[PDB]
């Protein structure tokens, strides 16, 4: 069982200090919940990883760790089947110790999307919500940030980002905590908050805006990141059962829609900053990730469109400042 102490220890003295009252209790019930069918093979993944002081670190243009001297065969070979239990490997990639994590995603593309639209994220406490793996808190330090704080309940992610952070010199600048948004109150006390692939898991897309809006001290920005199809302000898709295969997506707005339920949620200065179709060479199979991906959720005969026949994956970054 993974500790928190290090990260209560660290609030406890901090401007996140109040986030105590209901932090503690939620991570322990989320451990109790636990047997996941395959949590030991990734827990001994962490367990059994060497704690390494990099040497050289570059999280500035990419997640990069090297050391004086190269590692063994043998060395490197336990770091690659040690992290190939963590399989699949969604997002990222990692360069550890001549380990090469090729991801589903390149995730550093949508952080090169997002970057050049960004308020100076130097000396800022920051919220990845729904941040996988952790790829993009890295980044986020790499990018001057002071704290980077993560978000996912999801089991895997939580063992991926210790495994990385366990390579990086057990480094104390991001942590990532198995919770969802819902689950909490309103901090008011982010810098930046990031939510980047998010919003269409909502059933209430609104109060997701609100919930965000919630986390974030005033003058604080925003940063928002999810599926979207073109159209005016009053143009949003509803899916069906299956959207690029996947069975719980809510809301699809166009991006002028989603600009707009922004200003209703009580954002200003909103910005459209980029728009992209999302291509089989940003998300695809790797060796690292070996089960189905974009390829197979698009339909064979036109990439236009999804498997089911609605428009393809295309994914909309907004930037936005809370009064
Ligand atoms: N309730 C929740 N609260 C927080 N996270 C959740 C919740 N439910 C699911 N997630 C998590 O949101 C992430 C979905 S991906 C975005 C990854 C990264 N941010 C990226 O920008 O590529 C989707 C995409 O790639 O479009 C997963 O890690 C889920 O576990």
Redesign the pocket.
């Known amino acids: 069982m993974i500790d928190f102490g290090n990260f209560y220890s660290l609030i406890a003295k901090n401007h996140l200090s109040h986030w105590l009252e209901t932090l503690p209790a939620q991570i322990a019930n989320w451990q109790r919940e636990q047997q996941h069918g395959l949590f030991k093979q990734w827990s001994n993944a962490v367990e059994f990883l060497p704690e390494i002081k990099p040497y050289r670190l570059d999280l500035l243009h990419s997640v990069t760790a090297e050391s004086e001297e190269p590692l063994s065969a043998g060395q490197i070979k336990r770091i690659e089947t040690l992290m190939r239990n963590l399989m699949p490997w969604?997002?990222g990639p990692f360069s550890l110790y001549g380990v090469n994590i090729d991801t589903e995603?390149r995730?550093d593309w949508?952080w090169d999307r997002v970057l050049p639209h960004l308020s100076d994220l130097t000396g800022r406490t920051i919220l990845?919500?729904?941040?996988?793996s952790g790829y993009?808190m890295w980044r986020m330090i790499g990018a001057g940030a002071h704290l980077a704080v993560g978000?996912?309940?999801?089991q895997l992610?939580l063992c991926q980002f210790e495994a990385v952070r366990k390579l990086l010199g057990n480094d104390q600048r991001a942590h990532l905590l198995p919770?969802?948004?819902?689950q909490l109150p309103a901090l008011k006390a982010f810098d930046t908050v990031?939510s980047?692939?998010?919003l269409?898991?909502?059933r209430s897309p609104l109060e997701h805006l609100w919930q965000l809006k919630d986390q974030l001290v005033n003058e604080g920005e925003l940063v928002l990141?999810?599926?979207v199809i073109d159209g005016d302000e009053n143009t949003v898709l509803v899916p069906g059962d299956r959207y690029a295969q996947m069975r719980n997506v809510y809301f699809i707005p166009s991006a002028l829609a989603l600009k707009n339920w922004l200003k209703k949620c009580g954002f200003v200065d909103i910005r459209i900053a980029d728009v992209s179709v999302t291509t089989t060479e940003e998300q695809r199979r790797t060796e690292w990730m070996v089960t189905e991906s974009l390829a197979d959720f698009l339909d064979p005969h036109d990439p236009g469109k999804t498997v089911e026949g609605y428009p393809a994956p295309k994914?909309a970054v907004l930037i936005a400042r809370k009064p």
Do not use: A, N
């Open positions: 969604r997002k995603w995730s949508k990845d919500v729904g941040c996988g993009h978000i996912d309940p999801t992610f919770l969802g948004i819902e990031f980047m692939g998010v269409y898991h909502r990141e999810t599926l994914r």
